[PDB]
Every structure is written in structure tokens, then in C-alpha cells.
């Protein structure tokens, strides 16, 4: 009769903040950094061999590129050369992609103005 405890890292940023707090929370970012993409990023739920990362906000400057950004998000998880890591936007593996996050905002962002990311082990 144990009763499991947590998390609010395992709860999604979408059922953690309402959809209008979201919009309110990116409009002001955004006009306080016309500079940054405003990224949220999680682990895939049914992800078990990676690690959580210990933040789910990043601010994510418009010239850097998804590849980039793999290799930063990956550093940051403390991976080895080893571990199977794919960083998705819309269900694509973005360490091929060079284009600026700026580009992918306009085109894959959230209706909140969030740009959602999820990462795994297998890329589907």
C-alpha cells in the first residue's frame, strides 16, 4: 500500500500553466527580448532511458541553429557519445537542420506563441 509521490517535472508545461497565462507569459519575453525564440522543451512521455532535465524554459537567440541547439540541450542531459539523443520539433530530427530557430518559430510554433520541443531516444 506505498503511494508514489511526484513530480511536477512529469506534469506537462501545457497542463502546469493555463493557455492564457502562456500567451501573457510570451507576449511579455518577447517584448522584453524581440532578440530570443522562447523555447519549451520536455521529455517524451514514454521516454524512460534518458534523464528529465532539470529546466523546461529556454530562451533561444534567433541566429542559432537546431543543430546547435542539439548539441547544447544534449551537453546539458550529460550524455554519452553512446546515447541515442533526437530533439523534436513537430515530430522532425532537427540535428540536420541549419536553418535559424527564428525561421522554424514562424512556421512550427504554438497557437500560445510557445515554441514546443520533446527529446528521446528513438526518433518515432
Same mark, same amino acid.
Not at 83 to 91: G, P, S
Given at each position: 500500500?506505498?503511494?508514489?509521490?511526484? &513530480? @511536477? #517535472?512529469?506534469?506537462? /508545461?501545457?497542463?502546469? =500553466? #493555463?493557455?492564457?497565462?502562456?500567451?501573457?507569459?510570451?507576449?511579455?519575453?518577447?517584448?522584453?527580448?524581440? #532578440?530570443? !525564440?522562447?523555447?519549451?522543451?520536455?521529455? %517524451?512521455?514514454?521516454?524512460?532511458?534518458?534523464?528529465?532535465?532539470?529546466?523546461?524554459?529556454?530562451?533561444? @537567440?534567433?541566429?542559432?541553429?537546431?543543430?546547435? $541547439?542539439?548539441?547544447? !540541450? =544534449?551537453? =546539458?542531459?550529460? $550524455?554519452?557519445?553512446?546515447?541515442? /539523443? /533526437? $530533439?523534436?520539433?513537430?515530430?522532425? &530530427?532537427?540535428? &540536420?537542420?541549419?536553418?535559424? !530557430?527564428?525561421? !522554424? %518559430?514562424?512556421?512550427?510554433?504554438?497557437?500560445?506563441?510557445?515554441? %514546443?520541443?520533446? %527529446?528521446?531516444?528513438?526518433?518515432?
Amino acid at each position: 500500500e506505498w503511494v508514489n509521490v511526484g &513530480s @511536477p #517535472s512529469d506534469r506537462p /508545461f501545457k497542463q502546469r =500553466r #493555463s493557455f492564457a497565462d502562456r500567451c501573457k507569459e510570451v507576449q511579455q519575453i518577447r517584448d522584453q527580448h524581440p #532578440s530570443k !525564440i522562447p523555447v519549451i522543451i520536455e521529455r %517524451y512521455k514514454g521516454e524512460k532511458q534518458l534523464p528529465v532535465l532539470d529546466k523546461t524554459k529556454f530562451l533561444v @537567440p534567433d541566429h542559432v541553429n537546431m543543430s546547435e $541547439l542539439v548539441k547544447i !540541450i =544534449r551537453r =546539458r542531459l550529460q $550524455l554519452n557519445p553512446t546515447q541515442a /539523443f /533526437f $530533439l523534436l520539433v513537430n515530430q522532425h &530530427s532537427m540535428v &540536420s537542420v541549419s536553418t535559424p !530557430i527564428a525561421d !522554424i %518559430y514562424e512556421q512550427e510554433k504554438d497557437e500560445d506563441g510557445f515554441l %514546443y520541443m520533446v %527529446y528521446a531516444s528513438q526518433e518515432t
